[PDB]
Ligand binder design. Structure first.
Ligand SMILES: [K+]
Ligand SMILES: [K+]
Lengths: 230, 220
């Protein structure tokens, strides 16, 4: 955690490959259960996704699932309430039941350099995205997520090349590029300090699809967010 | 794998372009990259050299690659903007490294310093003593042939640490590649000279040298 905070301070991002301790037996099992959820995402070159937001208090570890704000309400109010301006299904029942989801939400936060101690007692909105990227046999530029801190975990990579992650300065110069390749390979970043992007994926075996599964969480300090019905 | 043990046993391995599988995206980016050699700045008679150069911070486990501040003394120019923007450069950087027989798996978690050189050799009518064997003072090297035009000679040479010639081969096709263990052999390349004596002989080459540097820090 402490090298990570300093890496985020200095460089705006920090990497955590799974190769430093990926699993005891019970953890490994919860990883497998979680990653399997990416096979059951609502289908829409091709991107399948699910989404939810959490009320989160770092001091207590309190995590509450915020009500899934309907798209028709956001659009017609022209107010997406800080969340995404897209229409996405909620996280599955078995995603939410998986204790690894709450564990990762709490544990990832400890890698971020929180600039004011008082923020640990405030609510944070935590946006949680399951993304499956698909390139079938047949790119967004540098950006921010409009949060304070982000984390990405690779759930899976299937017949995929490319997909390199790119870190840019606020001035849109490439300063770093890395590769999440193993399951649970992880990156943390300070979202107001860098911009980022990901290269397209392409199949290694071109007769088959290439698939990249990631879990992205974005943490935004929100001192005025109050508890909602759950 | 084969290149590893070939490097482990003999200190160098060849990878001809034909032994490689090339799709169309790779095909497209190779042409974009090789064309960069047409816009290099001169000075590194009978022999001319145009070049460009930069260094990267590299961690193999994560694939992290960071361009390091351009130091003007390896005045060599930096790699061009379109060179650095070509995804093939860092993809070769990472892929080439996988061929090296790293002695300790833990070195995969350390920083490496990677030098990346764009070399163009131009040769006009001969009136030129070839170089003796030598190191590059790295742990592992790779050379990729980008282009060879109207050129005879230019053979790559592998020597023993005793400075005796053990092997000689010639990179001739685009993306012909040589890997080597730099503390293990010495190497050299012979001069090129024009075939058609009324045109320049040109040999274009991408060289990367990898040096394990556990104490290298990230630079901002
Ligand atoms: K768990
Ligand atoms: K020459």
């Amino acid at each position: 955690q402490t090298e990570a905070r300093e890496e985020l301070r200095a460089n705006g991002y920090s990497l955590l490959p799974a190769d430093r301790l990926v699993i005891d037996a019970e953890l490994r099992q919860h990883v497998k259960e979680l990653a399997a959820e990416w096979e059951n995402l609502e289908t829409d070159r091709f991107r399948e996704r699910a989404y939810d937001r959490f009320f989160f208090v770092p001091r207590t570890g309190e995590v509450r699932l915020r009500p899934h704000r309907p798209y028709f309400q956001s659009m017609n109010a022209n107010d997406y309430a800080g969340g995404i301006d897209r229409d996405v299904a909620p996280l599955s029942r078995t995603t939410l039941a998986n204790p690894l989801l709450t564990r990762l939400l709490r544990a990832d936060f400890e890698n971020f350099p929180v600039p004011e101690e008082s923020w640990l007692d405030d609510p944070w909105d935590v946006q949680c995205h399951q993304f499956r990227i698909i390139s079938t046999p047949d790119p967004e530029g540098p950006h921010r997520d409009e949060v304070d801190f982000g984390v990405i975990h690779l759930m899976g990579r299937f017949n995929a090349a490319g997909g390199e992650s790119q870190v840019y300065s606020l001035e849109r110069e490439l300063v770093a590029e890395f590769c999440l390749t193993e399951q649970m390979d992880t990156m943390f970043w300070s979202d107001g300090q860098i911009l980022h992007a990901v290269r397209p994926i392409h199949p290694v075996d071109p007769t088959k699809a290439a698939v990249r599964d990631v879990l992205i969480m974005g943490y935004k300090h929100e001192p005025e967010l109050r508890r909602e019905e759950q």
